[PDB]
């Protein structure tokens, strides 16, 4: 359990994946040219987890960039760290997916998938001991949603004994591109229930609310939302990238956070929300667990936590961290399940993210996540009961029955979370 | 002269293994290069310390040990540690992919692929013995390797060395020093599979070692190094008789004869004192009576429980340092009147005592202060069943919903093994209640 | 706030303690099976002590002393007094008792009964001729309240906190009878509120302390403190200091407190006799409020603080 | 309070203090269970590959 292979598909997938590499390259002291100019050695001890080393002491990320149109991947190759990526790992087409799950999954996407698998196989074959894969994408479009899930299905067929992890962005009418987004998201969730071990649910509705109400941004942009997404992504990989007592990896994560195979959709949280006055430990814990700090638009007070994991970064008191975590558990013990003893894990890392003197990141497996699937389910049924906009999909070879199935499995998932909440 | 072989499995087993062998070399005057200037029989001998060390023609004293782990991070510390020159590469065994805190993954999936390699490395040590006693096995309950692979190794050792004794040193799981939510599952599965193959096992609860390091050593956040150097002191006093001249517990079979009347109830409770902080430039040196009295204080034992509400079956007192029998008997007579020490009516109400004149050894610059006398008590009491009930209840909470069970099934295990191992733990709990009334 | 759980719905005393704690605003009740709690109001039988004091960061307190049933079981109380050198059987305040089975003491009970039968003696048994569990001598010469020519028993409530301080409630209750004593029917022989139900002399057939102390002054020229209470305080001290090394939680990973109900018997020579020790007692209606609040003040909030006394501290 | 079996030497001594008198599976069976678990794993993997095949 050492090397991770990263993959990013579609517009959203390649934009948050780009900011992710820009952030962690900075934390490990890797410049845009792949050279190391850091001061400590903690940034080089586990660097092979995400970076390959080339002759000449250069560090090249182990990432693969995928898209059915070249618009977004051109901007990445021209960005701040565009020169850092291996040139061969750019795989893209020209037709695009038109925000249509069927095009990404069945027609346009099928032509390109084999080329992606060739690059994945090339990276995997060079791994001393491959952990698994992580994928970034949105569920409301065509490429990341439709083709992204097709890739997951194929990768599981060749590497069935490796972990599959995703960062999945949920659509919201408050930040919408097309009216068919509920269709695409319902079809992708069905796939995710079957073929991933861990999924971080990044809700665009929650990101918007945080920028508007807390950060006081009247007209938020995708750039603003991705600032929150990159902070969250850096926080939830800290324990994978730095040497610590934990020594975490993707399998131990899944083993300890997922009590039932289907219920592997996690709710992430971060604090503080982005000035020179560092926060006290009690401030971190309080903010980290507040609804205003959740990245999925669900109220944790409407459900219970199956498992929780939290990391603290900076130079702080471990005693004070323990004293504050045990405090929140024992003062909100009504929102934790009783039948999983010691289901809250805490860890500390001495390296704080750039700019902050200390921060805290939260991973939650809560039954309140059902409010998200309910939201998407109601939007789905309002259109489907009149067969509205279906011709876009029946023209790609799909039948109505396939929609009835994804909707049916989506509602089963909602009732499954309600089962374990009572 | 009869040899003993030690086996260290998983992270906990290997790290604790390093601590012990570091202390051994200090107590026997063996430098980190294997040289022993006090030994005058170069290349051989049948001395007491040769039960744990063999000798080469150049004068090196090599431990009779083997280190095993399904991943290599922890054993690489040994190969580059202060005592690297002590071991031979064939004695250290490492895999690629650990058991992911999964018993089934360590016993079935990955255990089958490496069991023969380890048995062949063990066979190489046995061949160099003329009169092998048995094995000492270190491991954890909670880890996927320490629980799953250990139980496979103990099954095979019984087959290849049917007449040899096997002792365990096991680390019982605690949330204060936690690593996985399924540690109750792995604890029950391995206790069920190892039981018929272990002659005597010493449990150490990480909650107890954690509280002692905080209370007595004034250490706010204890580390593995702190925990192990205190655990090494306990181990060194339990194995001192095998390495030094003496008459009490001079071979592995004596441990069963003096501590284990019933085969299944083979978990003696250990208690140690005094643990004094080395940060105190001076501390009153406790007497024989005082340190003996502390062996019946719950805050000093390796497994938190109330011996006042159980019955004893056997008791052994092991002293090290400036101790003479006269004082030991005075303290014993004193403790029988102050406290409640009730044996079972079918066992004698006595104590077996051993005294080693060499006082305890401490790591230079470590956390433990040098003392002039110390004692470790080994008592087989029913009160230790409290720890079985605590652990069995946590297993029942998760299993009622079948939570996490799919990770084990996916490795080839059947749900039936869960209830099978659980019913065995219910029978074990019942056997303690019959003895304790 | 502070955390407590409830595991005995039949507790009249702690039903008020759990209700008074809810009136504090600083205590909140959990589900009966939640492991993370500061205080447990646990069940009578098979309370799982072995699972207490193992939750990190939690100071856990419980309303029972493990091993305290040796004093509250009639068979084990007899054994405790006979085999305890601190009591040594020779204690002058416990009636001659013997334990039998349907080791046994059937042989030694009939031996002392022979020296007794020759002369008189009448015994009692629960769980005049011997031919017709534990057996002890029946106090054939009790103290009778006039008018009425009736017997009674005294109930005293004692509270022991985590530090093993012994607090004696200032308010007692005499559970009196209604029918004159006939040393020839068993209603005038057994003093119980349920058996009595009646209520002609006092309400509920229970006389409180201020009235009984006035009766002792006008009828006997003495006070309740000198004639009876001193002896009661001695018995309470002697019994609780005996088992202290066996149940004390002074160095244990969890802490204990427990309310006790001592039942005494007074004879016509103003001598106090201990009948039995109750581990799960009830209380009088006119005293449910004062006592239960005293518990929280001295026993609960003494470990879990917030933002004259009613007990007499029996030093030792 | 009796002491018995006092054994002295240069490294120490030992004795006993009494206060009151008193009132396996074969190699093939192992391999059998190990190979059974590997078969159940192989079965479960064949069903997934058959599911992905559809
Ligand atoms: N006292 C002590 N306990 C330890 C030590 N290392 C791990 N533990 C305990 O062991 C348990 C975890 O099992 P490990 O030994 O780390 O796991 P493993 O045997 O390596 O098996 P894997 O799951 O494959 O890693 C936890 O309960 C830890 O508290 C140690 O060095 N000293
Ligand atoms: N040796 C004795 N001499 C005089 N009276 C006795 C006696 N033994 C029992 N009694 C009477 O019997 C009554 C109840 O006896 P006992 O207390 O053993 O039953 P019990 O425990 O079920 C009710 P409680 O809980 O109030 O003690 C007492 O009120 C007492 O007056
Ligand atoms: C749900 O509980 C448990 C959770 C976990 C473990 C054990 C548990 O069980 S436990 N309490 O040890 O008994 C071990 C593996 N670990 C991985 C991890 C990844 C990340 Br990222 C983190 O950062 C947010 C983190 O937190 C700092 C931890 C999760
Ligand atoms: N948070 C975030 N969401 C995005 C971004 N770009 C697109 N989205 C969302 O993703 C969905 C559209 O999918 P998109 O990635 O554009 O389609 P694709 O290119 O076919 O994969 C809509 O719900 C958008 O709100 C982005 O940069 N950040
Ligand atoms: Ca020699
Ligand atoms: Mg788009
Ligand atoms: Mg390990
Ligand atoms: Mg009663």
XYZ file of N, CA and C in Angstrom, chain B residues 56 59 63 66 68 72 92 145 147 182 189-190 200 219 230 242 252 271 273 278 334-335 378 382 404 428-429:
81
model
N 29.004 -17.165 17.609
C 29.755 -17.421 16.388
C 31.243 -17.519 16.703
N 32.920 -14.375 17.941
C 32.582 -13.874 19.259
C 31.247 -13.172 19.365
N 20.777 -13.170 19.047
C 19.525 -13.606 19.674
C 18.860 -14.722 18.883
N 13.058 -14.175 15.730
C 12.592 -14.004 14.358
C 11.487 -12.956 14.369
N 8.498 -10.937 12.170
C 7.597 -11.161 11.046
C 6.563 -10.044 10.990
N 6.634 -3.833 5.695
C 8.043 -3.743 6.098
C 8.434 -2.470 6.840
N 14.748 -11.663 9.908
C 13.744 -10.625 9.720
C 12.968 -10.908 8.441
N -2.704 -8.434 11.298
C -1.640 -9.434 11.282
C -1.487 -10.095 12.647
N -3.443 -10.679 14.944
C -4.546 -11.567 15.292
C -4.758 -12.683 14.277
N -12.793 -2.201 14.398
C -13.135 -3.620 14.387
C -12.204 -4.420 15.294
N -12.049 -13.372 17.298
C -11.709 -14.373 16.291
C -10.390 -15.072 16.613
N -9.384 -14.320 17.071
C -8.070 -14.915 17.305
C -7.998 -15.635 18.647
N 0.105 -20.835 27.813
C 0.067 -19.778 28.816
C 0.285 -18.422 28.159
N 3.752 11.735 32.400
C 3.832 11.856 30.949
C 2.422 12.121 30.442
N 8.284 0.314 29.407
C 7.660 -0.188 30.623
C 7.213 -1.637 30.457
N 14.783 -17.678 32.868
C 15.291 -18.480 31.761
C 16.699 -18.075 31.351
N 10.124 -23.455 30.084
C 8.789 -22.998 29.707
C 7.689 -23.853 30.325
N 1.288 -7.882 37.721
C 1.341 -6.630 38.468
C 2.798 -6.279 38.734
N 5.782 -3.205 40.272
C 6.114 -2.044 41.090
C 7.559 -2.134 41.572
N 11.993 9.030 36.489
C 13.408 9.379 36.510
C 13.642 10.883 36.555
N 1.876 -9.753 56.581
C 1.207 -8.471 56.776
C 0.047 -8.295 55.804
N 0.197 -8.785 54.573
C -0.828 -8.557 53.562
C -2.026 -9.480 53.766
N 2.702 -12.582 39.375
C 1.910 -13.315 38.393
C 0.868 -14.129 39.150
N -9.747 -15.143 38.750
C -10.945 -15.067 37.917
C -11.359 -13.632 37.624
N -19.904 -4.054 9.490
C -18.528 -4.298 9.081
C -18.281 -5.765 8.716
N -16.188 -19.619 27.508
C -15.070 -19.181 28.337
C -15.555 -18.327 29.499
N -16.466 -17.389 29.228
C -17.027 -16.585 30.309
C -17.758 -17.461 31.317
